[PDB]
């Protein structure tokens, strides 16, 4: 977690449930990453406990998430002089989208009790709209390189953490040990506890 900083100054690293300064000593597993874009006026909307229009119908963040995001300004990656209309978003939904649930929406949303599945020219509204990425909107509408990272402290063997090297095993002295991210103080001795290796 040290090659992460060569991608311009960031509008992120405000981390809940994890310390951004200490990212190598702790060990965990099962890290999931997703990639999308944000407008810019709602960078802080990607947070647990926040519910509005953004991150309520596209990607809802759960209250118990213990993770954070990385994000910075995109001025040359995808913003062009002719504009960019690559990304879309969901306008209307029947209810709040459950977190960690990928969804697709192309069908026509209705705002009444009349039958409407594909009929236009009425109050039925298309639930998608095209992002206009232009340099003329400095803060209001700008592409961003936002990526969400998810972490969990499940009862699983540790897989991904810092590249810090190990040391030689020592016995008969009570010290602090870091065994697969488990912090504790005690003495290490040969154990007579023998069980099935599972």
């Amino acid at each position, epitope marked *: 977690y040290s090659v992460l900083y060569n991608f311009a100054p960031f509008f992120a690293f405000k981390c809940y449930g994890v310390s951004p300064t200490k990212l190598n000593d702790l060990c965990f597993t099962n890290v999931y990453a997703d990639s999308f874009v944000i407008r810019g006026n709602e960078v802080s909307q990607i947070a647990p406990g926040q519910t509005g229009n953004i991150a309520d119908y596209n990607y809802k963040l759960p209250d118990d998430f213990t993770g954070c995001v990385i994000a910075w300004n995109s001025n040359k990656l995808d913003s*062009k*002089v*002719g*504009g*960019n*209309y*690559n990304y*879309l978003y969901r306008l209307f939904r029947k209810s709040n989208l459950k977190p960690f649930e990928r969804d697709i929406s*192309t069908e*026509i949303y209705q705002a009444g009790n009349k039958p409407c599945n*594909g*009929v*236009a*020219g*009425f109050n039925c509204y*298309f639930p*998608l709209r*095209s992002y206009g990425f232009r340099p003329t909107y400095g803060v209001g509408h700008q592409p961003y390189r936002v990526v969400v990272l998810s972490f969990e402290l499940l009862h699983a063997p540790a897989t991904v953490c810092g590249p810090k090297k190990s040391t030689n095993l020592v016995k008969n002295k009570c010290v602090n040990f870091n065994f697969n991210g488990l912090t504790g103080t005690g003495v290490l001795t040969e154990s007579n506890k023998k069980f099935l290796p599972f």
Partner: antibody
Amino acid sequence: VQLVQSGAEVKKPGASVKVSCKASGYIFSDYNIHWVRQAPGQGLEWMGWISPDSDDTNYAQSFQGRVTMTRDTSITTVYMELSSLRSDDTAVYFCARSVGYCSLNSCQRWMWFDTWGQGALVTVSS
Amino acid sequence: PVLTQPPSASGPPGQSVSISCSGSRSNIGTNFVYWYQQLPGAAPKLLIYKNDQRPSGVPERFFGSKSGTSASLAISGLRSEDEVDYYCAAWDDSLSGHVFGAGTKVTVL
């Protein structure tokens, strides 16, 4: 501004002809480009689209493998070939451009041909 | 495929002529239809797109809107703007591409 397309004269059916589209004024690295042809006595028929920045290529349902769409930023032009031309599908080719930059099916709803580059009317005769 | 529109549309100036663009379910209603007017030997021109906002230099007298499974357009005043055919432009998933009209041959009378 407006675009140009270099065509050929009347040739025999059953051969290969190479066309080109060269941009003018603007930088040809930001604009999605389309293709379309108009049969004599009939409306326009959609062909497909590419982009001169990446390997995104789509065709119509009738000419999926008949033509090859090539791009090259260094010469700043786009070539297509027509292998074994018939006597019905030969038509004027519009080097149409669309604003923005995408290659998604759902993106095509908010894409319109803002300006139309004039092309060459090509025909075939043995 | 090909759209069904009456090609032999004509009439004396001073009245209103209405043309309707037939289409399938995925072509009109789930997408935004456009209208292209083309000239022989030159580039076409844009008049109606998304049926609610107009380009620069396009007169307000052109009227094209959708109200169901088939969009419709109406013309009024045949002096120069109705001297050449129009095209019904839409998008659908039947061929994963844009569709064009067959040509509404309207001249000046």
